[PDB]
Design a protein around this motif. Structure first.
Motif, PDB file in Angstrom:
ATOM      1  N   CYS A   1     103.231 -59.087  51.488  1.00 56.62           N
ATOM      2  CA  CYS A   1     102.612 -58.075  50.602  1.00 56.62           C
ATOM      3  C   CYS A   1     102.375 -56.751  51.311  1.00 56.62           C
ATOM      4  O   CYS A   1     102.734 -55.694  50.773  1.00 56.62           O
ATOM      5  CB  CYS A   1     101.282 -58.519  50.021  1.00 56.62           C
ATOM      6  N   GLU A   2     101.794 -56.794  52.498  1.00 56.33           N
ATOM      7  CA  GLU A   2     101.362 -55.599  53.205  1.00 56.33           C
ATOM      8  C   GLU A   2     102.564 -54.826  53.680  1.00 56.33           C
ATOM      9  O   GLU A   2     102.582 -53.591  53.621  1.00 56.33           O
ATOM     10  CB  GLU A   2     100.429 -55.987  54.333  1.00 56.33           C
TER      11      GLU A   2
ATOM     12  N   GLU B   1     104.021 -53.191  50.618  1.00 58.43           N
ATOM     13  CA  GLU B   1     103.152 -52.054  50.255  1.00 58.43           C
ATOM     14  C   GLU B   1     103.421 -50.828  51.168  1.00 58.43           C
ATOM     15  O   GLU B   1     103.602 -49.709  50.688  1.00 58.43           O
ATOM     16  CB  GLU B   1     101.669 -52.433  50.322  1.00 58.43           C
TER      17      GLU B   1
ATOM     18  N   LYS C   1      94.017 -55.576  40.783  1.00 59.85           N
ATOM     19  CA  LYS C   1      93.716 -55.551  42.215  1.00 59.85           C
ATOM     20  C   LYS C   1      93.854 -54.138  42.698  1.00 59.85           C
ATOM     21  O   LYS C   1      94.780 -53.400  42.340  1.00 59.85           O
ATOM     22  CB  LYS C   1      94.688 -56.441  43.021  1.00 59.85           C
ATOM     23  N   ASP C   2      92.911 -53.764  43.540  1.00 62.73           N
ATOM     24  CA  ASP C   2      92.934 -52.475  44.128  1.00 62.73           C
ATOM     25  C   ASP C   2      93.848 -52.388  45.378  1.00 62.73           C
ATOM     26  O   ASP C   2      93.394 -52.105  46.506  1.00 62.73           O
ATOM     27  CB  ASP C   2      91.515 -52.127  44.495  1.00 62.73           C
ATOM     28  N   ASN C   3      95.132 -52.559  45.137  1.00 61.46           N
ATOM     29  CA  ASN C   3      96.204 -52.469  46.115  1.00 61.46           C
ATOM     30  C   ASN C   3      97.424 -52.059  45.280  1.00 61.46           C
ATOM     31  O   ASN C   3      97.387 -52.191  44.064  1.00 61.46           O
ATOM     32  CB  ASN C   3      96.527 -53.831  46.726  1.00 61.46           C
TER      33      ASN C   3
ATOM     34  N   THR D   1      99.999 -57.170  45.525  1.00 59.54           N
ATOM     35  CA  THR D   1      99.127 -58.301  45.777  1.00 59.54           C
ATOM     36  C   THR D   1      99.889 -59.619  45.668  1.00 59.54           C
ATOM     37  O   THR D   1     101.101 -59.631  45.467  1.00 59.54           O
ATOM     38  CB  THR D   1      97.915 -58.271  44.834  1.00 59.54           C
TER      39      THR D   1
END
Length: 218
Positions: A110-111, A114, A148-150, A153
């Protein structure tokens, strides 16, 4: 605003022509364009024909909307399926194709994704999305996931196949100037009618900044 096209015949050809026209308009204005792609049974045939169009593919950057947390050569992988119809068929530079690296632990996948999205753009030009017969979009099955605050996710085992998923969130999807939904058949029409009556299915919350368009077959 929202526009809904109800199509009885020539679905794929009509959709491909509309997408072609939009992409060509975007390229008159901008050197590079950024396009989000869903997998699934409805978009894939559309991509298969898009891959045959004479675009300047080096100016087009592609991102998956979501990925099943399975190996990338699995028939359940969105990457594999979109690679088969598009990424391996049109001569799109490797550097222009962005996907979820499911070889990493899911949070890290995910990261990483992102970070890659952020590096590429702050705004998608176009999102080509499906919707499930439950109203789900991308791999957003639950509102918490979508909220979700991304930008990216992940989920618990969800949907079918019932596997963990990595997904763009409502936040990420809603940076898109144009959001296109590609749906066919009575059940998905039923879900769209629920959306028209403000039923909070996941797809209800995904809107283009300029326009949302549904291409509805059957």
């Amino acid at each position: 605003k929202t526009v809904i096209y109800l199509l009885e015949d020539g679905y794929v050809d009509f959709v491909v022509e509309k997408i072609r026209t939009k992409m060509e308009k975007l390229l008159e204005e901008k050197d590079k364009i950024f396009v989000v792609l869903a997998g699934g049974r409805t978009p894939l045939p559309v991509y298969e024909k898009l891959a045959e169009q004479k675009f300047p593919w080096n100016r087009i950057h592609f991102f998956l909307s979501d990925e099943r947390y399975v190996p990338l050569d699995s028939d359940q992988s969105n990457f594999r399926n979109i690679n088969e119809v598009l990424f391996s068929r049109a001569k799109i530079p490797s550097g222009n194709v962005h996907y979820v690296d499911t070889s990493l632990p899911i949070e890290k996948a995910c990261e990483k994704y992102e970070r890659e999205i952020r590096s590429a753009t702050d705004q998608f030009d176009l999102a080509i999305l499906g919707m499930g017969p439950d109203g789900h979009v991308a791999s957003i099955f639950d509102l918490e996931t979508g909220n979700k605050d991304n930008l990216v996710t992940f989920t618990d085992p969800s949907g079918d196949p019932k596997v963990p998923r990595v997904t763009l969130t409502f936040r990420a999807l809603n940076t898109s100037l144009y959001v296109l939904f590609l749906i066919r058949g009575k059940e998905k029409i039923n879900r769209l009618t629920e959306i028209l009556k403000d039923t909070p299915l996941p797809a209800y919350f995904v809107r283009g900044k300029e326009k949302t368009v549904w291409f509805v077959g059957k």
